[PDB]
Design a protein around this ligand. Structure first.
Ligand SMILES: CCNC(=O)c1cc2c(N[C@H](c3ccc4c(c3)S(=O)(=O)CCO4)C(C)C)ncnc2[nH]1
Length: 169
């Protein structure tokens, strides 16, 4: 079964959301594309990126180091397409702004625009958690920007409930 997403709540015609761990979603669904919440040097040291890398038994990190050696770092708001390993056909590494480190929140629109190069994606909420963006603002930018089919996995029931209530107001 291809892109077998289950238990999502449809918010708009192309944005769906679930209270779920993106790693467990990728193992079950084996989507065509999983989005990583990357940094510009593709160092997957913790958070979502560390969890996805650990689920590949460090194969994602070795591949990422080799991409950085040949191409240099990404820009904030940018992305690159690498292997999905055992989690997906492809991993789209997207760098949202880290507001806690002084990066511009306006780059969150550029970060979501990368999603439009892929017909179907499993993704986390960009710049949320320790990147410091307001997660309700990140959802609003996702809904206004992404035009392809995106399945958002948010691994926190408290935040999930706040995002759905914020959308349905
Ligand atoms: C147990 C293994 N899995 C995880 O640790 C895991 C954590 C996951 C997660 N976290 C969200 C998140 C979204 C973006 C984001 C960050 C965290 S960060 O702080 O790592 C860096 C910047 O970008 C939180 C808001 C809830 N969302 C989705 N699936 C998950 N899986």
């Amino acid at each position: 079964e291809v892109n077998s997403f289950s238990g999502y709540l449809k918010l708009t015609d192309n944005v769906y959301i679930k209270n779920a761990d993106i790693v467990e979603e990728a193992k079950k669904v084996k989507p065509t594309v999983v989005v990583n919440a990357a940094n510009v040097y593709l160092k997957h040291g913790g958070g979502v990126a560390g969890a996805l890398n650990k689920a590949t038994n460090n194969a994602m990190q070795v591949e990422s180091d080799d991409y950085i050696a040949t191409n240099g770092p990404l820009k904030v708001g940018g992305s690159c397409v690498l292997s999905g390993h055992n989690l997906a056909k492809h991993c789209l590494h997207v760098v949202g702004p880290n507001v806690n480190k002084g990066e511009d929140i306006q780059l969150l629109k550029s970060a979501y625009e990368n999603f439009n190069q892929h017909e179907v994606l499993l993704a986390p909420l960009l710049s949320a958690g320790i990147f410091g963006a307001d997660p309700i603002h990140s959802l609003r930018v996702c809904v206004d920007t992404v035009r392809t089919n995106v399945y958002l996995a948010v691994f926190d029931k408290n935040l999930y409930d706040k995002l759905v209530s914020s959308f349905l107001e």
